[PDB]
RNA sequence: GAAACUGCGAAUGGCUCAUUAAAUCAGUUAUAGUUUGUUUGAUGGUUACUCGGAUAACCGUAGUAAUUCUAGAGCUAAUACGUGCACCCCGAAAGGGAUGCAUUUAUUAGAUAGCGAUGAUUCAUGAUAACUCGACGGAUCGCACGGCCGCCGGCGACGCAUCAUUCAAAUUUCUGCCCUAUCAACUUUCGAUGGUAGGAUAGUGGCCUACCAUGGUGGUGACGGGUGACGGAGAAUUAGGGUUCGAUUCCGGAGAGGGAGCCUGAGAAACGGCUA
C-alpha cells in the first residue's frame, strides 16, 4: 500500500537506488481522511501501531473554538471553509483540514459577551458587570462580522488524526491578512 | 432433493425424501428464512408452514443468506461464519470459499425446514414425543426465573429438582448437577469488602 | 528480524559469566528486570555455576519454585531473574545472605553479608523530576521509583535503601572527595578517591579517580558508583577492596603462595 | 512585511492578540517574540533576537534543537532559499603508501535569515533533526571570508 | 479429568546468500523525532447480597467423490461477548453548573540570582475555558479461617489504566568498499534540490499533495556498466610492508518458486498465515 520509504526515491546526486528489500508495514501510510463540513457526523476509529487508536472523522458539523482574546471557549456549528492556503480546490470541496479558515456561528459567544459584559452585539451582579466594563475593549473588524453571526475562525486540530475540528477565532493582524485575501 | 425436517417444540427431527417435481414446485424460487406450507408437500402435511434455513447442493456447498442468486459464487469469508467453520486455523484469517445463493432451486440436494406451525395430524416421529433438554440452567440468575423464585428464596434447593441420577457400568450409583454461577456466597462478600479495603 | 530474539547464543554472552564455550549452543536469556542484560547475573548463574548448589538447569527450576531464594527482600521464581549490582541475595533455608559486588577484575562477587547488613541497599539516582500531579519522584539505575524523595537528592547521587520500609534512609551526595567504585567498563570493580569532574557541554563527563596506592584512572560518569561520604563506604568490600594488583604483582603473590602454601 | 506566503505566519506558542501588554515579559510571552540560546557556548545574533522573520527551522527562534555533531566548513552554495551546501575538507590516509589524499563532502544545511553567507566563506554548522530530504544541520555561526 | 470455550505462543529458533556497491555493513553518534506485549518499581478521585442475551463440547437430522469441506435443530458455562451500582463559573451568600483519568484546542504560569531539570526546549509539571458520542476507573478466581456483636478482617492468583524501567525496534550523524572513462556529464513534465501550508505516519523527512523558487551531483571520478559481489568479526600466507580469500555455526541484513496486497497482533508487509 501507501509507503513512506526512501527506497523509491533518487539519490541527492540523482542516481536510482536498486531495491534491495520488500516494503515493511512499520513504514506504510493510509488514506487521507478528506473531511468534509456535513450535519452527518461520522468518525471511524482505527488501529494503529502499539495497539492505540486514531480518530478519522468524515463528516464534522460542529467545533470547539477558542476565543483568544477573552480567554472562553464554546462550542460552535461549522457553517463554510472561506480560506485554505494548501490548495483552493479545498475550499470549494468544503473540506475539514488544519489551518483552514472556516466561518463559525457566532451565537455561543454572543451570549457569553452579554453574561459577562452585560451588552449587546439582581444589585451584586450589576456591581460587578459594570467592573469589568471599565476595561472591555472589542476590536472593530471583530464587532462588525458579529452583526451577520459568523466570525472568521482558523482550524487547528487535524480533524483526520483526532477526528475533532477545534480552532480559534481570528483576531488582530492574523484576522486583518486573511479578511483580505477575501476582498474580491 | 430430501428435506431435513425439524420441529424446535419438541426437539425431534426427521428427513424426508421427495421425488416429485410437482411437489417441489412449491419450495422452488423460494429464499431463506422464507414460509412454505405444506398443503402440496404431502397429505398428512396439511396445515402445516415450514420455514427454510439452508440447504446444500449436489456437490455439497451450503447456501448463505444474502447471496441474491441461484447459482455458485465464490467470497472471502471470515472464521465462526456460517458457510466457514475455520477450525485450527489463525485468528483473523481469511479463506476463499464456493457457496450456493439463498434462492432455492432444483440444483439443491437437501433442504434444511422448521415447523413453525402444525396442522391438523401430528406428524409421526416429530410431535408425538417431546425429547427432555438434556441440561439445566446453570446462572443463578436463570434458575430463579425458572422456579419463579425471589431475592430471599435460597436458589440452591432447587438444582435439586433437575439433578441427574444413573448407575455406572463399573459402579452402582452415582449423581451430578451443575455448579451455580454468580452465586452470591460469604466469600464473594469478603472479596468485595478486600477490594473496598485496599482502595482506602 | 520481525521481533524480541528469545535465544542468547553462549559465545554472544556477557564475559564475565565465565561460560564454558563448550558448554552448549545456548547460554541463559537473562530475563526483562530493574538490571539490564549485559550488567547482572541471571539467579541460574549464581545458583549452578557460582554456589554449585544446582548441578542442572533443571534443578535451579526446583530451587526457585520452592520458594527459597529471595532478591532485594522478595521471592523471586523467575531463573533467569537479572540480579545485579547492590543487589541482596537471602537464602534462608542455607542462612546465607550475599551482596553482588564486581571484584577487582571486573566479575560480580558473591560478598557474603552479615544478617544486619542484609537488611539495606545502595542504589544512584538517575533523575528526579515532578510527576503527575506536581508530586515529584527520582527513579534509581536498578528500576525502582520513590515519590517525595529529599528535595536535596539530585541525579547522580547514591540512596541507602531499607528493604524492610522501602524508604531512602539516607543519600550522598555526589562530590569529588568521596569514595566511588567503577561499576563499567575497563576499570570495572576498581576502588578510589573521586579526584576530579571534567564537564564537556554536549558530550560525556570525565572522572578522574585516584586509588589508595596512588594510581589514577580515569572513566565516564555513567559507570562512577558513590559507595560512601569522605573515604569510607557504606557496604563491605572484597578482600581486594577494588585495590586492582598488575600481573607482575599479582604473579609474585602466587610465587609467595606455592612456597608457603 | 515577511508575510509572503498564502497563510499567515507566526511563532507558535505567541499569543498576539493579548489585551494586557508584553512589556516586562520574557520572550515568548505577552505577544514579545520568541528566541532561545542554543547552549554549547554559542551566541543568539542580534538579527533573531531584534528581527521580525518566521522561521520554525531556525535554531535560535524555531522548533529546532542542536544535539549531536557540530562541524565546520565553508559555504560551497547558497543559492537555495534559506539553505545552502557546506563544503568540508579532509585528508584520508591511504595505508598502503603511508600517504593522504584530499577528499571532500557536500553537506547541506539550513540557514537562517539572521545568517549572512557568501560563497567563500567558513560557517560552522550544529547537528539536528530532519529538516528534509537531505538537510540535517543549522548554521550556528558565519566568519566572512577574509576576516 | 478427556473433550470444548477462553488465554497465550507460533514475529524466536532453523535454513539459505538470490537481489543489493555509501546501499548492506563496521566503528562512532542522535532521538529535545518515535513505538515498545512482557519483567521490575511506583501510581489510580469525595440488581449491587452481583445484570443481560448467545455459543462450544455434548446431543441428533444431514449433504458431498472429497479435505481440521460444510448446512439445520435441541441444551448449557465464563477472567468469552454486551451492559451497568461503581479549586473555577453562574447567582436569588442559598441554590445550580463543572468537578476521576484519558482525549482535543486555546489562554496562562513555569521567576529572580513558594518556584524542579538540561550544553540547549514556550521542557517536566500546575491552573483555567471547553471539547469527546472515550474497548479506562475489577459484576473475576484459589487457600485459610479468625476477630467483634449481622459487622470487620489475612495471604495469594488473574486483569484494566498511567509514568519510569527493562527487553527492542525504527529512523539517524561522521568516516570508510573491488574492476571499469572503449561510461563525462547526470538529475528535474510524472519530485529532481530547496521553501511555505497541509495530508499521511508510532514519529522526523518530497514520505505524499497544492503552490512557489531553480536548484542538486560531478577528473577529490558524479552518472552508467561489470562482479562466478551479502557486509563484518575474521581465513591463508606473511623478516617488514604486502597479496589473496571471507557461501558456511558469532553479529548485522535480506529471502522463503516470481511479484503484489493484506488480516491478526505489543511486535509480521509472516509465508510449516491469508488473497490475487
Ligand atoms: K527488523
Ligand atoms: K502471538
Ligand atoms: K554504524
Ligand atoms: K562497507
Ligand atoms: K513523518
Ligand atoms: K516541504
Ligand atoms: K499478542
Ligand atoms: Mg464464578
Ligand atoms: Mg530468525
Ligand atoms: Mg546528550
Ligand atoms: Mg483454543
Ligand atoms: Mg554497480
Ligand atoms: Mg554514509
Ligand atoms: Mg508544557
Ligand atoms: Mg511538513
Ligand atoms: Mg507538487
Ligand atoms: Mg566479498
Ligand atoms: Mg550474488
Ligand atoms: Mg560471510
Ligand atoms: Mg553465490
Ligand atoms: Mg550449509
Ligand atoms: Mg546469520
Ligand atoms: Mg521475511
Ligand atoms: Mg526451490
Ligand atoms: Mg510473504
Ligand atoms: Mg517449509
Ligand atoms: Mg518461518
Known amino acids: 500500500g501507501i509507503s513512506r520509504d526512501s527506497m523509491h526515491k533518487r ?34 476509529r482505527i488501529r494503529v501501531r502499539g495497539g492505540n487508536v486514531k480518530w478519522r472523522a468524515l463528516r464534522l458539523d460542529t467545533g470547539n473554538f477558542s476565543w483568544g482574546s477573552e480567554a472562553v471557549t464554546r462550542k460552535t456549528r461549522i457553517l463554510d471553509v472561506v480560506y485554505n492556503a494548501s490548495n483552493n480546490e479545498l475550499v470549494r470541496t468544503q473540506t475539514l483540514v488544519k489551518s483552514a479558515i472556516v466561518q463559525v456561528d457566532a451565537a455561543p459567544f454572543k451570549q457569553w459577551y452579554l453574561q459577562h459584559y452585560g451588552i449587546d452585539i439582581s444589585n451584586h451582579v450589576v456591581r460587578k458587570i459594570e467592573n469589568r466594563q471599565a476595561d472591555r475593549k472589542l476590536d472593530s473588524h471583530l464587532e462588525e462580522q458579529f452583526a451577520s453571526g459568523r466570525l472568521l475562525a482558523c482550524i487547528s486540530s487535524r480533524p483526520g488524526q483526532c477526528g475533532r475540528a477545534d480552532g480559534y477565532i481570528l483576531e488582530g493582524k492574523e484576522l486583518e491578512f486573511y479578511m483580505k485575501k477575501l476582498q474580491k | ?184 456466597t460469604p466469600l464473594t462478600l469478603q472479596r468485595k469488602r478486600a477490594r473496598i479495603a485496599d482502595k482506602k | 528480524a520481525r521481533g524480541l530474539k528469545k535465544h542468547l547464543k553462549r559465545l554472544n554472552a556477557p564475559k564475565h559469566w565465565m561460560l564454558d564455550k563448550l558448554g552448549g549452543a545456548f547460554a541463559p536469556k537473562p530475563s526483562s528486570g530493574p538490571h539490564k542484560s549485559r550488567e547482572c547475573l541471571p539467579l541460574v548463574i549464581i545458583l549452578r555455576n557460582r554456589l554449585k548448589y544446582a548441578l542442572t538447569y533443571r534443578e535451579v527450576i526446583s530451587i526457585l519454585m520452592q520458594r527459597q531464594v529471595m532478591v532485594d527482600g522478595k521471592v523471586r521464581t523467575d531463573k533467569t531473574y537479572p540480579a545485579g549490582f547492590m543487589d541482596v541475595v537471602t537464602i534462608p533455608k542455607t542462612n546465607e545472605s ?62 541507602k535503601l531499607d528493604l524492610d520500609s522501602n524508604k531512602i534512609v539516607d543519600f550522598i551526595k555526589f562530590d569529588v572527595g568521596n569514595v566511588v567504585m567503577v561499576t563499567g567498563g575497563r576499570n570495572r570493580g576498581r576502588v578510589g578517591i573521586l579526584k576530579n569532574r571534567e564537564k564537556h557541554k554536549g558530550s560525556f563527563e570525565t572522572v578522574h579517580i585516584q586509588d589508595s596506592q596512588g594510581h589514577e584512572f580515569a572513566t565516564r560518569l555513567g559507570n562512577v558508583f558513590t559507595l560512601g561520604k569522605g573515604s569510607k563506604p557504606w557496604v563491605s568490600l572484597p578482600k581486594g577492596k577494588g585495590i586492582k594488583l598488575s600481573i607482575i604483582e599479582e604473579a609474585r603473590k602466587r610465587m609467595a603462595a606455592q612456597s608457603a602454601t | 512585511a515577511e508575510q509572503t506566503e498564502k497563510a499567515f505566519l507566526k511563532q507558535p506558542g505567541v499569543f498576539l492578540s493579548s489585551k494586557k501588554t508584553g512589556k516586562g515579559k520574557r520572550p515568548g510571552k505577552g505577544g514579545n517574540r520568541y528566541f532561545k540560546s542554543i547552549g554549547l557556548g554559542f551566541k543568539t545574533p542580534r538579527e533573531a533576537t531584534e528581527g521580525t522573520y518566521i522561521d520554525k527551522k531556525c535554531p535560535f527562534t524555531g522548533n529546532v534543537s542542536i544535539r549531536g555533531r557540530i562541524l565546520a566548513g565553508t559555504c560551497h552554495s547558497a543559492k537555495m532559499n534559506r539553505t545552502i551546501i557546506v563544503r568540508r575538507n579532509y585528508l584520508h590516509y591511504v595505508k598502503k603508501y603511508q600517504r593522504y589524499e584530499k577528499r571532500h563532502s557536500n553537506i547541506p544545511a539550513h540557514i537562517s535569515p539572521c545568517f549572512r553567507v557568501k560563497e567563500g566563506d567558513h560557517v560552522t554548522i550544529g547537528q539536528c533533526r530532519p529538516l528534509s530530504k537531505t538537510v540535517r544541520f543549522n548554521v550556528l555561526k558565519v566568519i566572512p571570508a577574509g576576516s
Open chain 1, 11 to 44: 539519490r541527492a546526486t540523482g542516481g536510482k537506488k536498486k531495491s534491495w528489500r520488500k516494503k515493511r508495514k512499520y513504514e506504510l501510510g493510509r488514506q487521507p481522511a478528506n473531511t468534509k463540513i456535513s450535519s452527518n457526523k461520522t468518525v471511524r
Open chain 2, 1 to 184: 432433493m430430501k428435506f431435513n425436517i425439524a420441529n424446535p417444540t419438541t426437539g425431534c427431527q426427521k428427513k424426508l425424501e421427495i421425488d416429485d417435481d410437482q411437489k417441489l414446485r412449491a419450495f422452488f424460487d423460494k429464499r431463506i428464512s422464507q414460509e412454505v406450507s405444506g398443503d402440496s408437500l404431502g397429505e398428512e402435511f396439511k396445515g402445516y408452514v415450514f420455514k427454510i434455513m439452508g440447504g446444500c447442493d449436489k456437490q455439497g456447498f451450503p447456501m448463505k443468506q444474502g447471496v441474491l442468486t441461484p447459482g455458485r459464487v465464490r467470497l472471502l469469508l471470515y472464521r465462526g461464519t456460517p458457510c466457514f467453520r475455520g477450525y485450527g486455523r489463525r485468528n483473523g484469517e481469511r479463506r476463499r470459499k464456493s457457496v450456493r445463493g439463498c434462492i432455492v432451486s432444483p440444483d439443491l440436494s437437501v433442504l434444511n425446514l422448521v415447523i413453525v406451525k402444525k396442522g391438523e395430524n401430528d406428524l409421526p416421529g416429530l410431535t408425538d414425543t417431546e425429547k427432555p433438554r438434556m441440561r439445566g440452567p446453570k446462572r443463578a440468575s436463570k434458575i430463579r426465573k425458572l422456579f419463579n423464585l425471589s431475592k430471599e428464596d435460597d436458589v440452591r434447593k432447587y438444582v435439586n429438582t433437575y439433578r441427574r441420577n444413573f448407575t455406572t457400568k463399573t459402579g452402582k450409583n452415582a449423581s451430578k448437577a451443575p455448579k451455580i454461577q454468580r452465586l452470591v
Open chain 3, 98 to 159: 550475599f551482596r553482588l559486588l564486581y571484584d577487582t577484575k571486573g566479575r560480580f562477587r558473591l560478598h557474603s553479608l552479615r544478617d544486619e547488613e542484609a537488611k539495606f541497599k545502595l542504589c544512584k539516582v538517575r533523575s528526579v523530576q515532578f510527576g503527575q500531579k506536581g508530586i515529584p519522584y527520582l527513579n534509581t539505575y536498578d528500576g525502582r521509583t520513590i515519590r517525595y524523595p529529599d528535595p536535596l537528592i539530585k541525579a547522580n547521587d547514591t540512596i
